[PDB]
Amino acid sequence: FPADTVQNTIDMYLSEIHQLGADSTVSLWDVTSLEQLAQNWPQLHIPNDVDYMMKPRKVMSRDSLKHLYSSIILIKNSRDESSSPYEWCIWQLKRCFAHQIETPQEVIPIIISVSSMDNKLSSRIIQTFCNLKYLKLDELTLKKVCGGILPLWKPELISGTREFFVKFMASIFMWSTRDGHDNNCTFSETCFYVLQMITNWVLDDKLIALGLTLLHDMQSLLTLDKIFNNATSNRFSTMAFISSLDILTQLSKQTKSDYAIQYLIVGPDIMNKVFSSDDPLLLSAACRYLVATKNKLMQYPSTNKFVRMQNQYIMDLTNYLYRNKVLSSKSLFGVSPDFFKQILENLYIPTADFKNAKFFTITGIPALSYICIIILRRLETAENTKIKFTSGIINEETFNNFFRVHHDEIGQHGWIKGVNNIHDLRVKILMHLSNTANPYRDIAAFLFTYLKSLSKYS
Amino acid sequence: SSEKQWERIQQLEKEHVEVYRELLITLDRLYLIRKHNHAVILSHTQQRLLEIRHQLQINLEKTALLIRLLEKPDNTNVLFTKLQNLLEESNSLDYELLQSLGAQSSLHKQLIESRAERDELMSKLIELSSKFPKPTTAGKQVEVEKENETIQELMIALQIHSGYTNISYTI
């Protein structure tokens, strides 16, 4: 009669008082203990009253035994199409989609728990219910249901599985865009669930190329502009993709199992896309993927295209973020610099004396720019500077302007002593990023490996 | 108060960017179809490079006005003061998402190892049940049981109503 459970124990005793108006063989219902089930094993027979078993103190409580009735039936009867739990779970589930059930949220928890096991049953639900038609009837139950089962599902047949999923996944994507409502994010949640499943498909030695191709086939959808626009950037696309991108980072670290070089590098069309966006977590994922890609890089010759494209990313990424010599580059993310000067026309900047160099640094890269304000505030606080960066956004001219007025005493003390030029401030902005505290630490840590000076400062 | 107009802009800015994006999408291929009278068949990768360039244009433009407002953090524009919080939230929220995204993988791995354990258990149970002997006239025995019920219950009543000094399980 445990103390912590007295309230529950008293409540159930109260509920038992409130709810009243508020031969040679043995029946499964008649047994009262696991030991008794063990002893009368060749005498026990299961009553053919399916509904009673599947849905709902010193004296025995058969609800505890009802937890095992489903497993017992699947063991006494060799679990097969004739097994009675298969019909009832299907039957109520059909009633749930029909809205004929009195309370689908009361039945579904039993369904998703049971259907998470018995893979062949799990497949049958998937075949019958994982389709566009049942999405029309009820999206919430389907997304709640399929999301519950499919992470634990295993396809017994490799052939046609990705095509079935890709065809289904394209439909729900069109369903969200056909609605045109961002609140119809069911595509994104389904993306997260199937990629959670794909972890198992790549934990399997076989059907692993199946998971990779499906992973990259999906990843094209998430990176389409209309689902993830750098202006209308719904987050759900971003977390869904960095999760899928994350899977490749585990896949790269588990490269003890070999892979085809195709579908190991995510590819330029994806990376110029994420670079063109500016979500710092997404940028953190991108480099965090490339350090994982780096761990596989040296295993291939340098003069491979897949190595050559990923050498272009880091070069452009380093130049865009820290090296600042972007205008001399042949192109920024595939776009010629002659834009950039022209784009800054009809683009009013307070200090037009430096129109260009602002965009070639993390201190001016828009989302990372505001981050750099937060970085410098902590750096100033930790340093206990009595002088303060006068401007909000950090750059070469904001940097230099307030030192020239303080210059004769900046030499002694008053501001950060680890800095004497704009490059050092960018460096010291990264030095805070060079530790475990930041969630964005990986953008600095990844690119230390290529810029020699930054490596030394790390 | 001013919040009414602020929210009017919070929706009109969604309108403004939606329309600016479709305006770019018209402008670029209007120029392309200006170069050739029927250049309407720009390819998927060509379209995607165009999309990448437009995303970079988002980058440049929002950087431009972030520079306009933060390069001199003068707080004169009341809208800039709201943009400060609007920027703060965007990067304050990120850590929880990152951590939960990381942790769910471990939770699902716990689920997977539990399922593998359970599959092993079912295989063993199926084997043992297949190896077992099969499961197996009680007219006299059930009548004996009826006699038991009558004896035991009849005395369970009479002893209580006889004030018997030691009521016990009559079996």
Partner: peptide, 15 residues
């Protein structure tokens, strides 16, 4: 395999 990309490109064409 490539038919999946073709179908995906059809969706891209529809975007």
């Amino acid at each position: 395999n490539d038919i999946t990309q073709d179908f995906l490109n059809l969706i891209s064409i529809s975007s």
